[model samples]
Target: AMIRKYRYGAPFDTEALTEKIETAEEAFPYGEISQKEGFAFTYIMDEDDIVYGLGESNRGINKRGYCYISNCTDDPIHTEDKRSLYGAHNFIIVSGKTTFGLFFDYPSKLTFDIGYTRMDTLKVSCENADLDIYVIEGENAYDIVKQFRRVIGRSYIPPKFAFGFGQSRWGYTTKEDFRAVAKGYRENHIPIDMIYMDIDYMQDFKDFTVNEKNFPDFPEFVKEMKDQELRLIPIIDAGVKVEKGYEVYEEGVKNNYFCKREDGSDFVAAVWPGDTHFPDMLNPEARKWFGDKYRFLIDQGIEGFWNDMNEPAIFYSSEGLAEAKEFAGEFAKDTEGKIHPWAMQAKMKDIVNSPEDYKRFYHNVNGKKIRHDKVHNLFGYNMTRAAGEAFERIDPEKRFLMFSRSSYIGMHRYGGIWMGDNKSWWSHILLNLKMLPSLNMCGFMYTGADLGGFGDDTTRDLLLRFLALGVFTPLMRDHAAEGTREQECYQFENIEDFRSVINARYRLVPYLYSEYMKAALNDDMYFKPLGFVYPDDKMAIRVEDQLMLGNEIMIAPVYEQNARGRYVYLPEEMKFIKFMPDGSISEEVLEKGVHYVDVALNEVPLFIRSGKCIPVAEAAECVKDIDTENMQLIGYEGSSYTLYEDDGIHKDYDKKENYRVLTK
Candidate 1:
């Protein structure tokens, strides 16, 4: 792996936590590796220049128009218009006048403006001049991504069961509620492999404790689902409820494991649980202690978990709340209604995520009391690492499903990340589409968005359309907020449409997993933009809606509301197939240009490259039941596909010589 690193002043040793490959330091090659208040690299861009990669960022895959901040936020409102989502992937490749990648190895606040503030200029900055600038120059966009992945490390791999279609809603609390979920999917003949336990499953929203009234005899209930091939994945939060008689809380208090304020006292914040303290996941002993807490559930037969609210999302800090109570005294006295509505809400906003509140707490990174704001982005990363590190010590032979809401670049190797709290809008489907390749660029191979959206009410047609795109993402989970409409596949009108889309997911798992394995093993991208592969074609560079899913095929999903189909741009003559709900397939070759193909509501559109094929298996309800031996290759005439063969369960399966590939 080839990479040139330039150290800027005394950087904060972020790579020590993430573990970057050895790269010798050299004189800065790019524009002024200089510093004013911080480290900045500013350079002019070409008109045809396209900037790719910023992990789960705002705007488009081609990050040319806006500014993106590497700050993990709890804001659930933006996927269409905001700057930061839940993760900070501070890496970008400028692929125009020259093809190069810049990975700012800083775990703290960083900002990059690519042709946004000043048109045709990209300014990537870090507040602290202490950081390593990793420079990668490759032949093309994909090449640079491969080189960058190697420099970072191998991507995380989940069990095959984790790859199956999972149905999740924020409201599945009781055992009967989960039973109804399994009944709905199984009775309706839709492929469902797992169900999620959101915060509602926890007792009083307390971490590591089940709601006894809602889920009595949790082990038996877990076995009931497990026997039916329905895996249960619960949510793990960063904050521990501060209470008497709670083992986790008592142990943390006794051991001084929680994050501290100036005097080494526990810093207080509130989340799903009432008043709580966050475990200092950044510390070595504290991280292991917090991670071992998962044993409380894993002992009850749970094999997977999603780390949430680790943006260390503080609703109202203890300090911020007191300030608000005093400010509210003004509102209480303002019975005459003299307070302006604008300023009233503005003051209320300060109660949560106040800039000063972040500066109050500190993390015990090694021994130093690093201010919370200094290494803010690393909290979620280390929180997930807590579980990831524990998994190896707890049970090293088996694989577990792990993902997080808030993430940094290094977290990709620990678990995967989902695009946080998007709405049920057609625009979000395209928004999900654009993020795939960019996330893949940073080695987040097992990543996706909330299918059909997480915030708003979704229509029958909208979920149907969303599932078409969801079938292709590695984490195909349809999640919605509790207050939103109960929009499951069986809840929709045309149940068969949902089945058809999910059916394709099960059937195509072989192809999907195989390509993902090759990509992971080789430090390559599983999803790439059309322009990255078809670089010579001018038209391909602008086709933001379509992405090359591996080297064999292209995905073009219908992302618009009420529209029959969207215009798809073909980079070359290829075989087009629309997977139908009735299990019927039709194929046609489309020319290398734009065409408004007629895709039905039940159809998931994809194209095979001219001389390539994709291997698919018979549809099954779960990953364990899939017949891996029998596979059919579908593609253009005289095409071939690379089939990566491995038993998709167990740990270290990749190291075995028995796992090999066959070109079909």
Candidate 2:
């Protein structure tokens, strides 16, 4: 029997077709073929189109391409394994007044079948047939997909501060440096929510200890930030430095905290802090132990955390395991509590004991076995989970902000992830355009590429464009590597432009927060490709270079150097209000909703869908001081909207105790 679940309405069968009349005067070409293996063939109705969802695989929805799924670094062909497809398997599309989606096995097979079911209609298979294929249709794709099995409800409502702009210190050398930046922001009236402390804040990359020289009075420094209403989220590396007398290491050695080698010795590998060992996140006990470590930070009044190096990027065999195959084979079936450190080590050896050919075949790579190359992808997800559990235990009642640099499927249940190690280049900016939507599809809603590029020197114009994009992205944080030039907006000599750009970020906080609420409530991707909204529109499928933020705004950041203007195609008949930085509009009544406008060093083109309302929050000096009560709701000629809020760094919202929901 075929089943059909419609969103915001009743379920129906496909057989009662004679009830509705065929009224279309014209029909367009619809349907797709898969030349690429492992992908499905897609088809659409004459009036329907495909809307692209998130992932970095191919260009955004309008283009017919594929993204390299992260998580496990395995090739399906060589390994014949599906677990390697590291990202989400969800797909969304709208057709004929309905929205639909199909989430199958990731890196799934080509022969999978989808059928339509309605009243009085026999379940007609959409496989290899003359009949049209319609897997996702109408405006209810979001609701229908939620009805699917294995869908988890949204977690905590983020604190109001998380909605505002955040300033990060990737290379800030001292507490004075942070104070100076915070003071500068205040002097300029540039509102900021939070400040981040990169690995440099720690002593020798140790988790619980700080470099007293850089932060002489750790408690006082925390108090100062708290007094300013700002919060600190420090980066916690997964690898623990293996010092001979370090308490963490010593405790691990005494209590079997480390992942063991086949000989029962600690599994050591080279990492950021030199010789380091990873905690066994795969084990519940290890997860709890790491969670307890948060107590140290908690005592210092630290609230949020950013988990880094989680892809467990060790300088060892692929997948972080020196011999992953041997390890897995050995420990795959071991009893939970009975598996001692030595037993685990032996198990690892046995798991990876297969011959070289067998190992290569399982990992899907041909070269030397580096952990990154084998299980490179899932490492981030596992590490994040460990951190999530830690945060959950340390602050059982509060929302946990656990930011990560790498991740995989189901990582959304933890916190958020940032695009890693991006360079400051035009292509990288374009890559941002693709990455956000892709990650959204994988169910990781809070994401952003490093602003103004993480590497290389960025031009003022490039920084402006990057900042503008960041304001619209799920998370807004500006960061650059050490030794790079200081790229903070206020640092620019052209204060007027910098001020405007920074203020614009602050002004958009309400809108950003509202979209974040959508992610929390529905697991809906806020930034999506046009194809995802209208999958039947084949033309939209190939337009990955451009994307939409929810159903309201469209952004097409110029990715080429010295490029003046670009063209954006709209799938359906709708009015768009182009918002220019100078508060001017290039008004035009155009066919096909195509627009080609001038873009310069200081401008990034964006369009708001007619009838959409976006909420705005006052930018605050610190995240804790945001004034959510006085929100500004800006509507684009026609549509309506809603905004939500609750304490961000706590789990209390799950109880519906303190929350706000505003609809317009």
Candidate 3:
């Protein structure tokens, strides 16, 4: 691998820095780079050149017709025109005349314009002057990705149980509410290993405080759920309510640990608790103080947490709201009514979560004051790091389940990220499928979108099809919004269909978990796009409907609604299996080429490569209930498989003696 490094200003070590690229900077590789107010790099592309790898982004595998912004945000509506999302992975692979990869290690806003503004120009711009660019050359796109993964370090591995089925929603407040949901799954025989708690469980939406009214005995409730083989994961937001007597608020104030304004006053933003103070997670002392606060719940048997709102999602800043109110009052007094109603509404919506508000605050990093927008993308990453760093000190023996809504590249070492606030549209199902390989390229192996969708109502058929695809993802969780329709499996008329789909996920947990570990251990992707595996095949390069789960099986989900079947391209001769919702399977041999396959609504299409075997465990209630000793290895003759096992909850597997890898 050949690396060409370019340095503009004094760039901070993002902690993703390795010793290999620490030498003196060299001249810019791709001709004369332009630097005016910000850093910009331009390159010309051919008509058939493909651009891939912006982690969790929109557009097709060949990212040609879109403009993407790299700023962490809390937006729910995922339309094609929107540029930014929850993550900021500044890496891309150019696969055309020459295959090479570029990584921009800057923790600020960046933009990638690919054939959007101009016809054949690919321009990348960063908001700040301080940046480091690394250009890697490889024989192919997949080879470049593998080399980049090695530089970024190994991905974070969650416990084996995290690969099992999980259920979540914005609702579920009281103890009985959680118990009823658990009973619904158990009585209906739907496999579930975890349940997530939203903001309703917090006291006045304050961090680290549980609502005594809803959960009278929090510790006992956690233990009771654990006894039933179900883990309870709670939500932790980054903003602390500005209350006088609240312990968290008082301590933050006493320590002077909150973000400050240009005038050195505490910066105030409105979030879940109305008026809140954002923690200065960029400060080392503040991170330790805020991270250690999780000990309160950790001591009570809580094992996992979902860090949210750390884009520092401000509903409205105090100054921004005052300006809006004044503007509204002046507009109301206008007799001519020059302002249009829709235009006024759009202005008000933008004011609440505006970019101007993000620039109003500052963070104290190493006694130097820096504008928040200059380091905006690192807020969620540092917030998650605070918790993950604390977990290392708190429980050095076990692995804690941590995933965030907003993330950067370095955060993948500490935690994973969920694709933020997607809708229940058929298009998003394909979007979910397309993002897996790119996210894996950035070292985020354990990631998934909201299964049924987090916003809007979901149809029964849509939910079933989405869940079928969700079965192959590492983080398999079905979630929905509160006011939307209830989308639990048992709530639908065809309850058995949902039950069987979840059972299939549980039955394959052992195989899925084993491959997930191997991918992490070997620094490879558990989910691979067909093009990445078979670059020589012309049809595979354009194929996005099917993906390889592990190294052996290919899953072609029917993402379209009301479609009886779909078209699939077989890169090689394979054993095709139609896995039904009732745990029955029908198999046949499919020749290499494109074929239109028939599939029922309740069946998931799975294809096994001719010479590989997959181990299947008996379906159970959860990962803990699986009988590992009794398993079935199914495939053609001369096929072999490896089954991996460990304590499932600890970090002791880092040593070879604590885990076992058996072959069949």
Candidate 4:
């Protein structure tokens, strides 16, 4: 309710204009307020601004240039402190020289009303915040603080064969080892698209059932991967296993849908499959009975949904049970005791040990015994918002691709998150490309990680530099658990790093479905990050190894592992064009904008930023229906890019026959 609208003309003193740019040294104050831990603000940069994304920052934002900005805290990676991932109720401190930012909020008490306008200018207006802050305007005020960003939504159109080439198999085993990896990508003309299944296609881990001896024909392997334009995504976890004939743990212990204890009952917790039972998706009838149990797997073709452990992630033996009788229960005093008549066990323990003691025991059991804080991080944001509103109430119109390991920040309206359990090091393939534009500038733009490192000794040059930065990521998936060594792109022995990681993800599915239809109509994210399109470059708002593949191309792969050349950072009247590896091309002019050239372990330094235009697709096998009639508008000669074709899976593009929009 603090609407003092200023829009960058009046309101000053953003801490005395950043203490006069920290006493006009032009930038050198690493005074170290970044102790980590629920991080938000403690910045003090200028050591020649190099700080990159803390790839799951277990003390590595690339030699700790420094980081710790939390908002979805829970002690991200067991708190080494950077203010335990700072608690951002709202923030936007741009200033590399003034990309006009200072829109504050901290749940409103700390109000520094609106003042941003150029990150991309739409005349910014963050719909009355509960937790919001916006920024993107850039074209100066130092391009608005040299790449300084603070976005909140956008990026999830991922499905033009999830931008192509995927072949995973660390667990799959029957359903004829997943239709012989889709009949060896149709007898090797190879052009794959989404297939994932893992948790060995469940049964014991028991999420959404089916392990009937390795899936005894689970709807004919999802109608043979929807008749070959592939799509199957599975996984599902929020833990539910409390057997006694598990009908989703006896209908979430008869309707209350689990999560209770202070004398209420059912809270259990062991994970994998022993005692399980944790579903309080902060309870909206436990996300409408787990979103009507996805209408029995969306009538079986299974459009998409991965959502693992949901960071309700449990597994304790002792030091736990204490916080007010472990998440106490009993809600429905009026909704007619909301179900529940039998199957009850309720006796767990182990209060907390991490995720900042599960967010200070879920904000002290919902602010002193369930008064409410708007269901705070309501158990993995209501289990990916009750499985994306039960896959948009069973295909309401069309457009759903769900994915998560755990997330927050409106979990990008509904889906995508990956970076969990990473390892195969080359420093986690350059800390997962500087944590994908800091998780697409903190809105979780359908992010990715797990290409050659979900634990397995990787090193075929860190699985060809994490499959050349998982073909310009947005949800690329390669994955590897269950004791390692399998990553199937025809078990590579270097068939040119397996056809340059499957033809650079099938020639970038028309620039990843036109950067996922501009992250579904401008919410934004085609895996961006030069601080959200270079917002005032204090070396690209502390550079995170080159990004921006959507606003018109830019990638800096080679996360070292048999590297040929590296060290890049450029921005200042930009001019990068070096796609070479054979398809020759060269044009360089990045003087002291930092340099280090030559790369060829199947060289990949891809670039194209000279007045942009990109969109290319011709790598199909499953993104439903397929064929974008040969789409390919690459690096525009005239400039234009829209290409959003929908119907990915019901939400019927608001009922206008599914969805479409093309422009290239």
Candidate 5:
């Protein structure tokens, strides 16, 4: 692999871990590299070119027809037309005449206009001219991704239990609510591992404070759930409530850890907790101080956390409200038809992540007053890093489950990401499937979207269909918003189908976890586009509906509704396994071609390569209960599968090494 680095200006060191191999202006490989108001690079893309990579973005694996903004956003409703989501991974691979990767190491906003305006050119520009551009050339798309992963470092690996099926909803507020859901799943004989606690679990939406009214004795409840082979994961937001008696708020105020305005006043915004201050997570000392605050809950038996609202999502600010007031005053005098009602929402849009809102606040980076707009994308990354860095100082011997809703390229090493609030639309199923490989390309293997969608009411058929896609994803959690339908798998009718898909999840956990570890350890992607795997096969490159999981199998999920089957692209001769919810398996062999195969809503179809086997275990309620001693290997004859095993909870990796490679 070869890299050409362009120092556009004095770029903020984003800790990208790439070597500073500066390239001279004359040696530039791309057509034109220019820097005026921003850094710009242009490459003409052929019609057949398959452009890939843009972790946590809209559109398919081929991101050739969209304008994507690389800024961490707080928007919940994920639509295909939407350009940016929660993550800002500014990496892409163009595979047409050549397969190369481009990474813009700018923490602020960056734009990639691929075949949108000119329809024949790929134009790249950073909002700020200050950045580092790494243009990579490699043997292939996968090779470029592997090299990028090696440069960024390995992705985070959660504990073994994290691989198990997790059930989450924004409405699981109280102790009884959580217990009832657990009981409902258990009574239905369905398997589960972790239960996620959303915002309502906190006291008046404050961070880190469990509501006594809902949880009653938090520590004892955590232990109670643990005894039943269940773990509770809580949500941590970025805002600190303005209440004077709150320790988190008081400490932040005393130490000057919050972001400040130009006049040196604390920057305030309204989020889940009304009128809250955002900790200057990008600042080194403030990040440490905020991260250490997790010790209070971590000491109480909490081992997992999902950071939310750290897009540093400001719902509304004083200036924003004042601006709205001015708009209201103008509207008061205007005729009813004079002002557009939708125009009134511009300020609301501004509060949500518009460029104007970001320019209002500032971050103190090493005592240097840098405008927040300069580093807006890194807020959530630093907020998550705060916790991940604390995990080391808090307990050097253990691993904690940490994932954020918003992240940058480097956060993959610290935690995973859940593609923010998706909707209950059939289009999103394909959207969710396409994101897996793209995210893996950016070193985010432990990423998945909100299963069953997050906003709209989910139908039983839609949930089962979405859950089938979710089964293959590394982080398999079914989540929905509070006001949306109550979407526990048990809540749906035809409950047996939900059981089958979720049971298949537990049955496949052993293999999934094994492949995941190997991928992370080897700087590889657990999920790969079929095109990347079989570049020579025309259908493989064109088929965005299918994906290869690890080195063994390829999957073609039923993404459409009212469909008994979908077309499966068989990149090679493979053994097909259909896992049913009733603990039944159907096996078949098919030659390399496209076949219209039948896939039921409750069945998960897996295509193992011609002669490779993967280990499987019986459906267990939790990861600990999984019977690893007596596992089953399923595949055709002449297969060898090396299964890696360790204690699963520890991360020491080298001390008194206990390793196993079960070649079946």
Candidate 6:
């Protein structure tokens, strides 16, 4: 691997945060940074050039015809027109005759016009001059990505139990509600390892406090659920409610730990709790204070957390609201009691998550007050880092389970990320499939989408097909909105089919977990695109629907609604294994080529490389219940596999101790 680094305008020591490269003082390779419209850099791209990695981005493995903005926003409507998303990963691989990768270590807003403006020009522009760029050259795209991951350090790993199926919805509020959901999974024979508690479980939407009335004796309740082999993971938002007597708010104000305005007054923003103060996580002292607060829940036996709204999602800021109110007054005076509905609607939209509002806030990064918009993408990343740093102090030896909806590249080492707020649309299934390899490229190995979909009503076939795809994802959880149709596996008419798909996931946990660890330890990808492994295969370059799992198994999930099956491309001669909804499997051998195979709505389409073996465990109610002593080794004659085992709840593996590898 060949690596080069370029710096401009005293870039922050982001290299200090990396684990691979200790020092980099090389000159710029392409050219000096030119400032015309912004700090711009232009490069040439061939017609067939494949631009991979922008982590959780749209478009294809070859990211062309799209202009991606690296500005972390809280938008949920994921259409082609919108460029920015919840997380900003500034890593990309340019694969053509020469395979090389580039990582922009800039915290502020940046834009990449792959082929959007000029079809053959790759233009990159950033708002500020404070940026560092790392260029890595390698034999292939896969090698460059591996070198990048190694430089970033090990990806965050959750407890082994987190790999099992989980059930979450926006409505699991009360203690009884959680118990009932857990009961539904067990009594209905659908396996589940975790249940997520949304913001409704919080006391007035506070970050650290639980609702005492709804969840009486919270610690005892946690113990009871743990005894039943179910873990409860709660959500943590970034905003602290600004009530006068609230302990959290009082402490933050006393310490001046909240973000401020240009005049150094507390920045006021409205979120889940009406008016709130955003924590200044960019400040080390403030971050330590905010992080140490997680001990409240840690003491209560909470092993996992979901950091959300750290895009610092503003419902409306006081300044924005005031501006809107002024505009409304003028409109009322002009219209004379005949206001236009469209005009009013437009004004309301501007008041929520407004860019004008974001610019008004400031963060004291190392005692220098920086504008929020300049470093907008880092809010979620820093918030997660705060919690992760706290976890290190909270449990020095244990592996804590945490995932964020909003993330930056540095945050991946601290926690995993979920592709945020995807809809129940069939297109999102393909979206989920396409993002896996890209996310893995950026060191997010323990990542997945919200299973059935988090935003809309899902059809039975959509959920089934989504579940089939979800089985390969490390974080396999079915989640949906509060008022949408109930999409729990047991709620469907063909509940048995749902059960079988989830059971298949549990059965493959041994293989998946082992592969996940191997990938992380070796700085490789757990999920790979066909093109990454077989760059020379012409057909693999265009096959986006199918993905290889840990170098052996390939998943070609049926992603369309009302369709029985989909066409699959086989780059090599392989054994096709069909997993039916009834937990039965059938195998056949097919030559290397494209084929149209018929499959039922209840079947999962999987392909195995001819000379590989996969270890399978008997499906259990939870990961804790998995009986690894008795297992099945399926496939090829004389094929061998290795299973790695340890106390799945701790970080002793990092010390190269306590784990044992058994090979067959």
TM-score of each model, in listed order? 0.97, 0.71, 0.97, 0.34, 0.97, 0.96
Candidate 6 residue-wise lDDT at 570: 88
lDDT of 3 by residue, 538-628 (tens): 7898787788888889989898889999999999988887667668767788999988888887876788887887877778988889987
Backbone-clash count (model 2): 80
lDDT of each: 0.85, 0.57, 0.85, 0.54, 0.85, 0.85
264-362: candidate 5 lDDT, tens digit per residue: 999888887889999998889999999998997898999899999988788788888788889877876878667776777665565555566678789
Clashes of 1: 1
Expressed as tens digits, the lDDT of each residue in 66-182 for candidate 1 is 989988889988845577778899889989767788888888888888887988899988788878778888888778887788767889988888889998888888888888899
Per residue, candidate 2 scores C-alpha lDDT tens digits across 513-553 of: 65667556765767766765665676765577777787666
- 2 or 3: which has the higher lDDT? 3
Candidate 4 structure quality by residue, lDDT tens digits, 405-467: 655444556776777776676777776776665455445656777787877577666776777
Q: For every candidate structure, what is the RMSD over all alpha carbons to the true structure, in angstroms?
A: 1.9, 12.2, 1.6, 20.4, 1.8, 1.9
TM-score of 3: 0.97
lDDT for position 440 in model 6:
94
- Candidate 6 has an lDDT of 0.85
Off by over 4 Å in 5: 18-26, 333-351, 654-664
- Candidate 5, poorest ten consecutive residues by summed lDDT: 654-663
Report how far off residue 316 is in candidate 4 (Å): 31
